[PDB]
């Protein structure tokens with residue numbers, strides 16, 4: 001039936017700034033929040049402010065040296081940390097900005113708090129749109145991600161769940177989460193992403209895990225222009241097969257919105273309905289679910305996507321006419337919640353989609 005939803009948000013998150021021209025805009029989390037408050041969704045869910053995750057919490061995965069560096073580095077002392085910055089991959093893609101460590105603490109606090117709430121059976125679904133920073137590595141920042149809140153949230157879930165399923169619908173391969181759990185069968189990682197001359201360069205369908213983790217890493221590489229119909233015809237069958245074979249007792253769904261049509265960095269052609277169809281599919285399995293954010297660089301579309309996905313999590317129909325909000329002008333010229341796909345060519349032929357699905361089904365038979 002309808003589910004209890006716990007949502008994590010800190011009013012300060014929107015003030016963190018990556019720098020002039022950087023595509024990652026934490027302000028998009030504030031726009032999402034303001035939009036869902038104006039739709040009245042606060043009436044249907046419990047809103048929590050996450051705690052700031054500590055160094056102890058972060059070192060359940062990350063190295064002590066890397067976390068000590070993140071806690072120390074500031075724009076005023078960068079000159080003294082030149083060598084350290086290069087070692088930890090902090091610089092241009094992952095800049096040093098005012099309050100960087102606090103931003104990591106808030107993003108992580110929401111994911112970990114959500115996992116705790118699910119473990120305690122106090123909620124059916126936990127939502128943290130400030131989370132989903134899937135590229136961060138044990139001792140290195142990557143692709144705008146510094147602390148891997150997902151890996152930390154999964155490790156929390158593993159205290160009470162023998163098998164955890166991770167699903168990543170961000171346009172980028174969730175390399176950091178895959179790497180952390182590559183040699184274990186206690187976490188199955190499933191990533192759908194653009195592959196071929198595209199960041200981070202990983203996620204080939206032949207990357208299937210290693211040792212005890214062999215067959216517990218699933219990658220669906222895609223080309224430019226995938227649309228709602230093509231994505232929907234592959235997502236439901238793959239996830240259904242994964243659920244049948246793997247039988248997880250908890251799920252983590254990374255909802256990176258950069259897979260939408262018109263994204264600044266992405267080259268997919270999904271609409272908000274096409275993207276949210278994934279949430280709907282995962283929700284039908286009735287398992288404890290942690291929903292996270294991630295990418296999304298055309299910020300009006302990110303707010304639309306995550307507001308609709310929160311409404312989907314709540315089983316609450318919301319009108320297409322956007323209600324007035326603090327960021328109403330960002331939603332012009334239509335002021336509608338839903339988006340139209342572009343006329344871009346879908347390079348993912350129906351035969352290519354079926355072939356990759358068939359190849360992944362062969363791997364799933366090995367479970």
Ligand SMILES: CC[C@H](C)[C@@H]1NC(=O)[C@H](Cc2cn(OC)c3ccccc23)NC(=O)[C@H](CCCCCC(O)(O)CC)NC(=O)[C@H]2CCCCN2C1=O
Nearest residue numbers: 020021022023092093133143144170172199265294295296
């Ligand atoms: C200016 C920073 C980099 C020097 C530059 N990155 C980008 O163009 C851009 C960043 C960038 C673009 N502009 O202006 C057009 C910037 C302006 C200032 C700072 C950074 C950027 N980076 C990339 O696309 C990707 C990262 C994508 C991360 C997605 C994260 C997620 O999956 O969605 C989850 C949260 N990285 C790159 O392309 C980097 C590293 C590999 C080699 C090529 N790269 C780049 O040319």
Ligand SMILES: [Ca+2]
Nearest residue numbers: 168170172192
């Ligand atoms: Ca992905």
Ligand SMILES: [Ca+2]
Nearest residue numbers: 181184187216
């Ligand atoms: Ca694995």
Ligand SMILES: [Zn+2]
Nearest residue numbers: 170172258295
């Ligand atoms: Zn992304």
